[PDB]
Amino acid sequence: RKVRPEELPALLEEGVLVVDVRPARSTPLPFAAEWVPLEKIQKGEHGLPRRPLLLVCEKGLLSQVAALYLEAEGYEAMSLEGGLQAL
């Protein structure tokens, strides 16, 4: 499921874990996010907690893919529609 900018305030307060999937990262990070590059998520070499995860990226290209990879492993992932630019 995608998350439109207007739905963020609700998720944030609920303490959603924000995960940055960008590579080794232009636009600032308005969230206390944990950085896990897609490259690494594609290799299963990460250690994200078994909890809802909001993946973000520059334009929404990488987060949506990674959002898929995590879905298979059993994760409850989601992404910010439009990336950090929709903001």
Next chain:
Amino acid sequence: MRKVRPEELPALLEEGVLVVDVRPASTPLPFAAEWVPLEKIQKGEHGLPRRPLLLVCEKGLLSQVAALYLEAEGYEAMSLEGGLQA
């Protein structure tokens, strides 16, 4: 560092704090924890987000150190008192 009593646990978890299991490779992990070794934290080579953290381990010893460490880096890290077994 803040010694979380099992009694205040529900209150914290309801907030959404990120739980971190520091035990190295023994009670179950009743939290959607993120495993981060103590040594990995002592070296600052951890990647925990800048959000309230609650450390946990077996007897509450290890988690009490990583807390001091992470606290130094401007982190709000607390420790589950008594550890997991308690």
